[PDB]
Design a protein around this nucleic acid. Structure first.
Ligand SMILES: OC[C@H]1O[C@@](CO)(O[C@H]2O[C@H](CO)[C@@H](O)[C@H](O)[C@H]2O)[C@@H](O)[C@@H]1O
Ligand SMILES: OC[C@H]1O[C@@](CO)(O[C@H]2O[C@H](CO)[C@@H](O)[C@H](O)[C@H]2O)[C@@H](O)[C@@H]1O
Ligand SMILES: OC[C@H]1O[C@@](CO)(O[C@H]2O[C@H](CO)[C@@H](O)[C@H](O)[C@H]2O)[C@@H](O)[C@@H]1O
Ligand SMILES: [Mg+2]
Length: 580
DNA sequence: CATGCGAGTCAGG
DNA sequence: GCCTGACTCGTATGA
């Protein structure tokens, strides 16, 4: 039975009630400077559909949109807020976001539309967006009649679902998480995406020309060493050359053929000169295709900026993700790739890039949650945690710690966070499972509190069915009870890791909110550009650097109070590359 | 030929 | 051992 609503030709007073479910539809996946195809409002007075051209041109409606006292309940308010920003319209008063509410209740559901969220509460009087708009090449906005009914049904669902979702969040003790953390953060992410990051395209293009030159040389050297030309970027073709023509040892095979992963190649390097060249070709090719050409494709030609979209409702741990482009995985580990960062510059003359990052936040969080005396003392002394771990595992003085000892202690620390696994550690340290287990055993002997936490958290995950983070984020782990070793083990590691990675996510999100409040109180022009899991990147007038050096680390270090201090390092410079 | 899928790969924390 | 996203190739359908 069709849903009744008024297809309005003009905005009326009853459409501006102080509480309503609001839909400002942007069908385009990437909502930057995208069109708004329709608007729906459901409130105490009824259900309404408004054409965007009329609604967005009406002073009363626009004023209502920007009035913080007029409360709106929506789904993915960031999408609408950013689309409206590109139109010079401010959206305020969003007191409930169904997407974020759904995400907090169960990030595993992968709720990406109103229909999916509504299905969680047995509400199915709304169609999934894909069914209405189609997908990809066939994606398209339907005729007004169909479009109008769909937006109204989504608004109607939101109107009906707010109460039950809020009630469950409250029983989960996640009400403040939604209202005081995720929703306020959504607005901050909206500002960041809209602001964008300036790219020096001329510099990128120049790097691309040089890369193309080097790739050409390595490419030819590879054909020369192989004795024939082939598609180096084809794991299949490369496999034939390496393991058949050149007879290199097959130490690993994928599900469908020979493995040519870098870790595999690294082992074959001693056998033939072609290997080192393939690795070099892989590095340069990655930079060229993904960080030069890929980046250049998404730079807005008019503003010369990239406007990423932070998916705030995707990861199972509470972390954000970044797309079009992904600005959370710009090269930095290898110098040649790190140079890509010289292309990210301040958006204004005489401004500078400022970057602040937490030092070992995950291990500090673990020290706090596990209450491991040794680990807590280590951070209280602000010791080099890898050297310290090496000292305990190997029972040597600081002077006796060799570079390799520290390298292995570092590997154990990087993994201890992801949940112990002799197999996983063995792979990273290229050792036997028996030996890896011995390392783990030694680690636990030195950090008994951590061992206790690992056992206790797995037990809690089994008892309650989920694990939680410092700010009450949760993750259900049904596989924790599986009678399949591998499946159960994966769930156990998630149980061990989620409270760590997740609480670190909670902390930096809170830091972002606290930071913006401080930046506003101080009337600084500085503003956030990016978040990369444990670091914040801002840009600001050079005249604000000294103030930022004191303000940013403090706000980040004081976001939450743990049993150990939080430490933040910072750097600034003319480009993102220089912010080191 | 057209768009779209998985597989394999590798970039980041 | 955890958490992500983008690009290539080669196959899928489909013209
Ligand atoms: O607006 C971001 C928000 O939308 C979802 C769907 O509800 O993702 C859509 O938009 C992303 C950014 O363009 C795309 O990567 C994704 O493919 C598309 O479905 C949510 O996942 C996200 O929180
Ligand atoms: O010149 C392009 C032509 O070369 C082949 C091999 O003969 O592939 C090479 O060039 C591609 C584009 O630069 C790379 O992806 C590939 O790795 C490299 O070997 C052919 O496949 C292609 O038609
Ligand atoms: O040997 C106990 C030890 O094994 C772990 C896995 O590393 O858990 C196993 O044993 C528990 C019973 O003590 C079960 O609840 C669990 O399902 C099973 O995998 C550790 O958590 C535990 O300390
Ligand atoms: Mg750091």
């Amino acid at each position: 039975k069709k849903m009744a609503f008024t297809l309005a030709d003009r905005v009326t007073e009853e459409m501006l009630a102080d509480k309503a479910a609001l839909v400002v539809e942007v069908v385009e996946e990437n909502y930057h400077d995208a069109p708004i195809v329709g608007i729906a409002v459901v409130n105490e007075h009824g259900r309404f559909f408004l054409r965007p051209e009329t609604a967005l041109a009406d002073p009363q409606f626009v004023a209502w949109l920007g009035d913080e006292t007029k409360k709106k309940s929506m789904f993915d308010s960031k999408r609408a807020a950013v689309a409206l920003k590109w139109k010079g319209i401010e959206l305020c008063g969003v007191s409930f976001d169904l997407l974020l509410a759904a995400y907090l209740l169960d990030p595993a559901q992968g709720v990406d539309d109103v229909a999916a969220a509504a299905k969680m509460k047995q509400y199915e009087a709304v169609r999934p967006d894909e069914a209405v708009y189609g997908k990809g090449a066939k994606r398209a906005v339907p005729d007004e009649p169909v479009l109008a009914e769909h937006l109204v049904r989504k608004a109607a669902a939101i109107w009906e679902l707010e109460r039950p979702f809020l009630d469950e969040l409250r029983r989960n003790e996640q009400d403040r998480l939604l209202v005081e953390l995720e929703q306020p953060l959504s607005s901050i992410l909206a500002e960041m995406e809209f602001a964008g990051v300036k790219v020096d395209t001329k510099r990128l293009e120049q790097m691309g020309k040089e890369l193309a030159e080097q790739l050409g040389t390595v490419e030819q050297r590879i054909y020369e060493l192989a004795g024939q030309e082939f598609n180096i970027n084809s794991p299949k073709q490369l496999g034939v050359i390496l393991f058949e023509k050149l007879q290199l040892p097959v130490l690993k095979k994928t599900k469908t053929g020979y493995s040519t992963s870098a870790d595999v190649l690294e082992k074959l390097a001693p056998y033939h000169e072609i290997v080192e060249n393939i690795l070099h070709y892989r590095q340069l090719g990655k930079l060229q295709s993904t960080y030069i050409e890929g980046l250049l494709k998404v730079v807005r030609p008019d503003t010369k900026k990239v406007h990423t979209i932070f998916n705030q409702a995707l990861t199972q741990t509470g972390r954000l993700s970044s797309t079009e482009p992904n600005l959370q995985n710009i090269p930095i580990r290898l110098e040649e790739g790190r140079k890509i960062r010289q292309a990210f510059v301040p958006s204004e003359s005489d401004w500078l890039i400022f970057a602040a990052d937490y030092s070992q936040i995950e291990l500090r969080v673990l020290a706090h949650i596990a209450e491991d005396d040794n680990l807590m003392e280590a951070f209280r002394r602000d010791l080099d945690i890898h050297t310290k771990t090496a000292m305990d595992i190997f029972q040597v003085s600081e002077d006796e710690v060799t570079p390799n000892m520290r390298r292995q202690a570092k590997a154990v620390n990087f993994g201890i966070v992801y949940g112990i696994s002799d197999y996983g550690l063995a792979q990273n340290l290229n050792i036997s499972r028996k030996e890896a287990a011995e390392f783990i055993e030694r680690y636990f002997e030195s950090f008994p509190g951590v061992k206790r936490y690992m056992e206790n958290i797995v037990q809690e995950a089994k008892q309650k069915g989920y694990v939680t983070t410092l700010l009450h984020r949760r993750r259900y782990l049904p596989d924790i009870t599986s009678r399949n070793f591998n499946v159960r083990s994966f769930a156990e590691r998630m149980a061990m890791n989620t409270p760590i990675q997740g609480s670190a996510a909670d902390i930096i999100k809170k830091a972002m909110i606290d930071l913006n409040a401080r930046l506003k109180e101080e009337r600084l022009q500085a503003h956030l550009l990016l978040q990369v899991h444990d670091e914040l990147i801002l840009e600001a007038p050079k005249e604000e650097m000294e103030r930022l050096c004191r303000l940013v680390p403090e706000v980040m270090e004081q976001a939450v109070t743990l049993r150990v201090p939080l430490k933040v390092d910072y750097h600034y410079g003319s480009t993102w590359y220089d912010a080191k």
